[PDB]
Structure 1
């Protein structure tokens, strides 16, 4: 199908020309609709050098609809739900939650790509913003007690490395 052909093509490109600090691909090539991504927090940001695994689950009509994405280890970020689900503009078409994200942020369409999703997630990790309320406690503590948020961010980084 076109979804499988498209996911196979994106995987080929990602393996040929990998983006910095990210490894991603199907957990097993007999099911290209379930990928695992490993993302490192960029230097000089809140979660710098942390290593964060996530699962991308693609819909049957990909690339017309975006995947769902979920971190599978602990996170504490205003835009990541407590169960790990990622809440960013690029993972939604212009029609769903049309105002729940920044007007400047790109929406899903077939010209987007897995590479563009993961780069957007990296930016989100670097630049937490408390105006998507996916994690209420994280958004409030980002707004009201950022020192405590920073302390937790550093613990999360250290645990993600086992140190």
Structure 2
């Protein structure tokens, strides 16, 4: 019931992605039996300080999706103003400002945007937020040697 509608919605999101796959992103569920676990990658955008870097994500969708957002974690360590120690992200689109008409594509696009411009307000990683502004060269070194 709850899980029937969430499975149908994830399949609808999958249909959207395959018809018009977004650039900079890869993403696919673990399997049909594990449709609620997706793995994704995002590549650092051109003209960003993360340009060309590759970053690895897992999205774990709840059974009442899309009433609630997936849990989103970076599964490879990252040094980023908007990512907590355990890899969880700080992004209002998938937290307090979640909308039930957002899709997997919405989510991946919004995560990619954190590599276009980090959010400096109330950062999850304050050292990363300060270093990003104060010393971009050293910030790049910390990203690489994480």
Same fold flag (TM > 0.5):
yes
Counterpart-to-counterpart distance in 2, 1:130 and 1:142:
9
Q: Which residue pairs with 1:148 in the alignment?
A: 138
Q: Distance in 2 between matches of 1:6 and 1:149?
A: 39
* SS of match in other structure, 1:8: helix
| TM-score, scaled to structure 2 | 0.89
Structure 1 residue 17: deviation in Å?
1.4
Kept after mapping to 2: 8 A contact 1:78/1:132: no
Moved more, 57-66 or 127-136: 127-136
In the alignment, the residues of structure 1 paired with residue 142 and residue 136 of structure 2 have an alpha-carbon distance, to the nearest angstrom, of 10
Tell me the SS of whatever aligns to 1:137. Answer: helix
Q: Which residue of 2 aligns with 1:49?
A: 52
**Structure 1 equivalent of residue 42 of structure 2:** 39
Moved over 6 A (4+): none
Q: Give the structure 2 partner of residue 3 of structure 1.
A: 6
**1:83, CA displacement in angstroms?**
1.6
Residue segments in structure 1 that go unaligned for 5+ positions in a row? 94-106
Q: CA deviation at 1:143?
A: 4.3
Any unmatched runs of 5+ in structure 2?
A: none
Deviation at 1:133, TM superposition (A): 2.3
Report how many aligned residue pairs link the two structures.
143
Q: Which residue pairs with 2:123 in the alignment? A: 133
TM-score with structure 1 setting the length: 0.80
Secondary structure of 1:126's match? coil
C-alpha distance in structure 2 between counterparts of 1:143 and 1:48, whole Å: 17
Instruction: Confirm whether residue 85 of structure 1 aligns to residue 88 of structure 2.
Output: yes
Tell me by how many angstroms 1:110 deviates. 1.3
Q: Give distance in 2, aligned partners of 1:132 and 1:117.
A: 21
- State which of 50, 61, 79 in structure 2 corresponds to 1:58: 61
